[PDB]
């Protein structure tokens, strides 16, 4: 009714288990400060395959992100963020999965490397997400997003403007510092005034 | 007539009116849209506004 927030975490083999932990720390901590009375969460991990960890329907039964994020293990493989977000709009945001209709749907993606080995592109996924009204936010973590040529793909995953939905971090630990802005920009439904 | 009235005094208000942009969609086959307007001036600070538009899908 309020909002349906889905988290998309990368499970590539480039990310080390220790850093993958920092990622789960982030999503759980962010999930807590964004835990409202009508806000549900869903999370899907991706590499070459896709593994849903929890949908909105079960998060309603267990509103504790720390107990649903703790048993999360790495998949290991390459990156398939295109086909991944496609599944989010069709499966994660599905009514039968607990997703509510007329509710604000926001998607956040956390990846460490450029999309490699994905049979699908952004052109075949993004325009679909834009239709249903799913707003996205992307977080770039790693050397893969240090070049402006790579930053462009981040601007494709997220919604316009890029200077409002694209976050960049050098290490998984520094993710704690972006938690503040993410929280504020996820609560800002419209441009307020000073 | 009434009275010759030249530049007696300038009007105050803001340093200018708000800029009205058009709703530029992100996707042709239905999608979200964006709008941005800025306000500048001498004493007026750079005020930025970014709104979101919705396609009718008619």
Swiss-Prot record, chain A:
Family: Belongs to the integrin alpha chain family.
Residues of the VWFA domain: 4-182
Tissue: Predominantly expressed in monocytes and granulocytes. Expressed in neutrophils (at protein level).
Quaternary context: Heterodimer of an alpha and a beta subunit. ITGAM associates with ITGB2. Found in a complex with CD177 and ITGB2/CD18. Interacts with JAM3. Interacts with THBD. Interacts with complement factor H/CFH; this interaction mediates adhesion of neutrophils to pathogens leading to pathogen clearance. Interacts with TMEM268; this interaction inhibits ITGAM degradation via the endosome-lysosome pathway.
Subcellular locations according to the entry: Cell membrane; Membrane raft
Organism: Homo sapiens
Disease (UniProt): Systemic lupus erythematosus 6: A chronic, relapsing, inflammatory, and often febrile multisystemic disorder of connective tissue, characterized principally by involvement of the skin, joints, kidneys and serosal membranes. It is of unknown etiology, but is thought to represent a failure of the regulatory mechanisms of the autoimmune system. The disease is marked by a wide range of system dysfunctions, an elevated erythrocyte sedimentation rate, and the formation of LE cells in the blood or bone marrow.
Role noted for this protein: Integrin ITGAM/ITGB2 is implicated in various adhesive interactions of monocytes, macrophages and granulocytes as well as in mediating the uptake of complement-coated particles and pathogens. It is identical with CR-3, the receptor for the iC3b fragment of the third complement component. It probably recognizes the R-G-D peptide in C3b. Integrin ITGAM/ITGB2 is also a receptor for fibrinogen, factor X and ICAM1. It recognizes P1 and P2 peptides of fibrinogen gamma chain. Regulates neutrophil migration.
Glycosylated residues (UniProt): 94
The protein, known as: Integrin alpha-M
Domain notes: The integrin I-domain (insert) is a VWFA domain. Integrins with I-domains do not undergo protease cleavage.
UniProtKB/Swiss-Prot annotation, chain B:
Coiled-coil region(s): none
Inducing factors: By heparin and retinoic acid.
Post-translational modification (record): Phosphorylated by NEK6.
Tissue note: Osteoblast and brain.
Disulphide linkage map: 15-44, 23-53, 30-57
Domain of life per record: Eukaryota
Compartments, record wording: Secreted
Record's function text: Secreted growth factor that mediates its signal through cell-surface proteoglycan and non-proteoglycan receptors. Binds cell-surface proteoglycan receptor via their chondroitin sulfate (CS) groups. Thereby regulates many processes like cell proliferation, cell survival, cell growth, cell differentiation and cell migration in several tissues namely neuron and bone. Also plays a role in synaptic plasticity and learning-related behavior by inhibiting long-term synaptic potentiation.
Protein family membership: Belongs to the pleiotrophin family.
Subunit structure, interactors included: Interacts with ALK and NEK6. Interacts with PTPRZ1 (via chondroitin sulfate groups); promotes formation of homooligomers; oligomerization impairs tyrosine phosphatase activity. Forms a complex with PTPRZ1 and CTNNB1; this complex inactivates PTPRZ1 protein tyrosine phosphatase activity through PTN interaction and stimulates tyrosine phosphorylation of CTNNB1. Interacts with ITGB3 and ITGA5. Forms a complex with PTPRZ1 and integrin alpha-V/beta-3 (ITGAV:ITGB3) that stimulates endothelial cell migration through ITGB3 'Tyr-773' phosphorylation.
Protein's name in the database: Pleiotrophin
Organism: Homo sapiens (Human)
Residues of the full protein shown: 33 to 90 of 168
